[PDB]
Amino acid sequence: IAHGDGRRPNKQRQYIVMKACNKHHIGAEIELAAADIELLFAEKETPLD
Amino acid sequence: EALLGVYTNVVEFVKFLETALAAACVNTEFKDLRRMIDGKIQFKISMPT
Numbered sequence: 001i002a003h004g005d006g007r008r009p010n011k012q013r014q015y016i017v018m019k020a021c022n023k024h025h026i027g028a029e030i031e032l033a034a035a036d037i038e039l040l041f042a043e044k045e046t047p048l049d
Numbered sequence: 050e051a052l053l054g055v056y057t058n059v060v061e062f063v064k065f066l067e068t069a070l071a072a073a074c075v076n077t078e079f080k081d082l083r084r085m086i087d088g089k090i091q092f093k094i095s096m097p098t
Binding site: 033034035038039 | 080081083084
């Protein structure tokens with residue numbers, strides 16, 4: 001608050017505080033059949049039934 | 050002292066579709082046999098009387 005007329009503040013304070021990021025670990029598993037990966041990508045790029 | 054010759058076998062094989070054994074089987078080569086687990090083809094066979 002501004003000065004004057006019987007009002008004496010504890011004049012402007014400034015912190016500088018260094019805080020930490022906190023790491024979090026998330027695991028997931030995807031299982032894929034090897035038949036689909038191989039048939040959808042072939043050297044002979046003729047279309048599929 | 051000499052080195053009079055240097056020789057080596059070359060292996061050639063008659064593959065399956067060129068033998069006479071394919072006269073006793075029908076060959077239908079499929080793209081990826083890992084796709085289907087079990088074939089369970091069912092036949093309705095009817096005798097005459």
